[PDB]
Amino acid sequence: AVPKRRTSKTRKNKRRTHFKISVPGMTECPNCGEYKLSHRVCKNCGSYNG
Amino acid sequence: HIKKGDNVKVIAGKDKGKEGKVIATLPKKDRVVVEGVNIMKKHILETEAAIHVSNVQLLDPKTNEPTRVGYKFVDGKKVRIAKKSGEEI
Amino acid sequence: VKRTYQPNKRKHSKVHGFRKRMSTKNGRKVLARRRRKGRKVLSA
Amino acid sequence: MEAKAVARTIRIAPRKVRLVLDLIRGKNAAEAIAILKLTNKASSPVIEKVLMSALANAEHNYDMNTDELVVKEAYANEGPTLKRFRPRAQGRASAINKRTSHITIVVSDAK
RNA sequence: ACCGAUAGUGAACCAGUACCGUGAGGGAAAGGUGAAAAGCACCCCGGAAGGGGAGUGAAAUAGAACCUGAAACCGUGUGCUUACAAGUAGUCAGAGCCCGUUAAUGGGUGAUGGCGUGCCUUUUGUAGAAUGAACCGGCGAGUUACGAUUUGAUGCAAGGUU
RNA sequence: GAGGGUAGCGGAGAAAUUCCAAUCGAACCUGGAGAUAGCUGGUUCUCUCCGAAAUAGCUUUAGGGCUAGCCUCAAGUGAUGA
RNA sequence: GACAAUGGUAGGAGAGCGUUCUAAGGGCGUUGAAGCAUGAUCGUAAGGACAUGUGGAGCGCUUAGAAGUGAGAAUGCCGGUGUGAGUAGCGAAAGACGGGUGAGAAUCCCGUCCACCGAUUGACUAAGGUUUCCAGAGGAAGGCUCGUCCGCUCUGGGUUAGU
């Protein structure tokens, strides 16, 4: 079917309330010094050492 | 017109009051290049730029004053003469 | 599905060419009407 | 002081860039860099290059320390769209807007 | 007492041309840096695009996507208010909180109370589930010539006038 | 398959009003041409004074028109109005 | 100064506001014109001013004249921008890993294994297209994703008849 009626920018902005992404969930590698993704290898120069 | 090799005086502009020799002439647009007038800086080297021929006035050979030029026929040819005095210029 | 235009050089020049239009009397009028408009292609 | 850097007519729709600009607005500088490095989104490298540019103007253009800066502003405006088409069934043809965006980032040392 | 780039030629631009049709034939849309290119040497991030400076300039939110730059639309920050409530979305009364003007019985927001079913067209009668409009901007409909008749004005007057 | 023919008051049809460039109870283009339309839509600024009709007659007339009726402006008459 | 009167459609009468242009008079303007943005101002209405920002050269006032004279609505024309909504789709099908190149690789190059057609997806030619063919470079747009690649962009080439 077709929308019976136009959508306000209040209804639209409400419905985009939960449309987002989250922070990548990252730790700090204790060899590279830099940041990394937990349970993944250090994308910088380094390894896993798990 | 104003042919080059002529000593003129700048009647208008921000160089007004100076005076120099005509170097180049662009008579399709009525522009003349004076020496030491309209120094421009381009990307950094510095040159002269053209100025409209309406703005420079010729100097009287007698009293060093800016005048107009007229034409006479001393012979079977033309001669330019100043308006203040009457001497060929 | 066979469509309406099948290109062909001989038929195109034998029906709409300059000589075909300059052959009849209402083709000379088509050329005289396309020259007045300023069209850059009189016959093809 | 504040330093700023812009990237104009980036060829990504603006409401796809505003999704990842909202994760790094407010954070520190070295934290926002790692966030932009470790995210799946296609607009991550562009924002990362704009952020590194605004972090590099600070060291040279107006001298300041790059271990104190925080992302004070980060936003994306519209730019000129491109108008393409897509030929659909029964002779019709629908439009296609190729959006662009202008990404601005302002880093401040809090002073 | 003609138009001024949606106007004026269809065409102020390299238009009867992109194109579109087998063909005869149909037909757009596109103006503007600065007084002078003096049209950004050089340094920095980037692979480039693009910036940030520093210089040219009277001006660079004048940098060739160049006068001005508005509305719809899209964002970023914030002052007051909002998660027990039934809303043509306003109006009248009215605490609290934040400000301070073309200085005058001041501006912003609104806990709560009363009253309140849009606009146009067409109809005996429409809130109407009768019609039209997504929003914004520009364009868009009783006119001119020649005659007739009635009224106001003006000049002459048994005359008036080409 | 290739090369040719039949042209719209016309042509072709083992005929179905089929088909003649995605168009056929009569193609497309340009002109007569701003055809006509008693029909639907629309009509671009304010305030002030007054303010209807939806009826009779005739009509190839019935959702149109013309005359009278009911409104308004100006000059006149003048008590004839209720 | 006393008395009364003042709802209104169709439509009839009167008085007015504003827009572009012209004549005559009197003015303003780079010490900043019109326009355009804001404001808490004035008038019975249409509407008129003033201050600030911007902009960058024209423009009002008075009295008359002349009109392409004022638009929310015509399934109105043209241009722009939204909603539906990060929604439907991404066009029949088998790929996997290794090594490169590179700013960036599921998607480009080389390789091994696997898979598909094989009276055809193989080979040659008539129409028809008309430079799309090759080598060296490129990555703005086209490619329904990516692209370091291409039937795309740039620069140089390529068609040889007595049968």
CA dist D73 and B79 (Å) reads 75
Which of D19, D22, D35 is facing A24, going by the closest CB pair? D35
Experimental approach taken:
cryo-EM
Q: How far apart are CA D107 and CA D71, in angstroms?
A: 5
Number of structural domains chain A divides into: 1
Q: How far apart are CA D20 and CA B1, in angstroms?
A: 68
Cα separation of C34 and B77, whole Å?
58
A39 touches strand E (CB under 7 A): no
Asked if A5 CB < 7 A from strand G, the reply is no
3-state secondary structure chain D: CEEEEEEEEECCCHHHHHHHHHHHCCCEHHHHHHHHHCCCCCCHHHHHHHHHHHHHHHHHCCCCCCCCCEEEEEEEEECCCEEEEEECHHHCEEEEEECCEEEEEEEECCC
In terms of CATH architecture, what is D1-111?
Alpha-Beta Complex (3.90)
> Can you tell me the distance from the alpha carbon of C40 to that of B32, in angstroms, rounded to the nearest whole number?
46
Distance (Å, whole) CA B34 – CA D19: 62
Touching chains D and A? (3+ Cβ pairs < 8 A): yes
Q: Do A35 and D38 touch (CB under 8 A)?
A: yes
Q: In what helix (H) or strand (E) does residue B71 lie, and over which residues does it extend? A: strand B69-75
What span, in angstroms and rounded, lies between the C-alpha atoms of B56 and B51?
Answer: 8
Q: Which nucleotide lies nearest residue D82, CA to C1'?
A: G141
Residue carrying the six token digits 């500088």? D29
All domains in chain C, ordered by first residue: 1-44 (1.10.287.3980)
SS3 label, residue B73: strand
Q: What share of chain A is helix, strand, coil (3-state, %, to 5)?
A: 10, 10, 80
- Dig out the tokens for D53 from the structure: 């540019």
With contact defined as beta carbons under 8 Å apart, do B1 and B8 qualify? no
> Max Cα separation, chain D?
64
Scanning every strand, the nucleotide with its C1' closest to C2's CA turns out to be F22
A21 chain-D contacts, CB cut-off 8 A: 19-20, 23, 39, 41
The whole-number Å distance from D9's CA to G155's C1' is 29
Tell me which residue of D1, D91, D87, D4 sits closest to D50, measured CA to CA.
D4
Whole-Å CA distances, B19 to D23, D68, D100: 67, 60, 56
CA distances from A16 to A13, B37, D22, D89 (A): 5, 66, 14, 32
Q: What is the rounded distance in angstroms from the CA atom of residue B39 to the CA atom of residue D55? A: 40
Burial of A43 (0-12, 13-18, 19+ CB in 10 A): middle
DSSP assignment of A11-31: HHHHHTSS-------EEE-TT
Phi-psi region of D50 (alpha: psi -120 to 50; beta: other; left: phi over 0): alpha
Q: Which residues, in sequence order, are bridge partners of residue B80?
A: B71
Task: Look at D38 and A26 and tell me if their CB atoms are within 8 Å.
Answer: yes
Coil, helix or strand for C3? coil
Distance from CA of A22 to the nearest CA of D (A): 7
Report the C-alpha gap between B37 and B14 in whole angstroms.
Answer: 9
Q: Which residues of A touch D35 (CB under 8 A)?
A: 23-24, 26
Residues whose CB falls within 8 Å of the CB of residue A2, separated by 6 or more in sequence, listed in order: none
The answer to whether the Cβ–Cβ distance between D38 and A20 falls below 8 Å is no
Structurally, how many domains does chain B consist of? 1
What token pair was written down for D25? 């607005």
Return the number of other C-beta atoms located less than 10 Å from residue D28's C-beta. Answer: 15
Q: Residues 6 or more apart from D38 whose CB is under 8 A from it? A: A24, A26, A35, A36, A37, A43
Which tokens sit at B38? 């309209």
CA-to-CA dists, residue D68 to A28, D31, D33, angstroms: 19, 11, 14
The parent domain of residue B29 ranges over: 1-89
B44 has which bridge partners? Answer: none
Q: Which tokens hold the place of C13?
A: 């020049």
Nearest one of B22, B19, B30, B18 to B6, comparing CA atoms: B22
Q: Can you tell me which residue has the tokens 């079977």?
A: B76
For D73-92, give one letter per residue: b (16+ CB within 10 A) or e: ebbbeeeeeeeeeeeeeeee
d(CA B36, CA B13): 13
**Strand E closer than 7 Å to the CB of D60?**
yes
Q: Spell out the residues 6+ positions from residue B17 whose beta carbon is closer than 8 angstroms to its own.
A: B9, B10
| H or E element in which residue A36 lies | strand A35-37
Any idea which nucleotide's C1' is nearest the CA of C1? F22
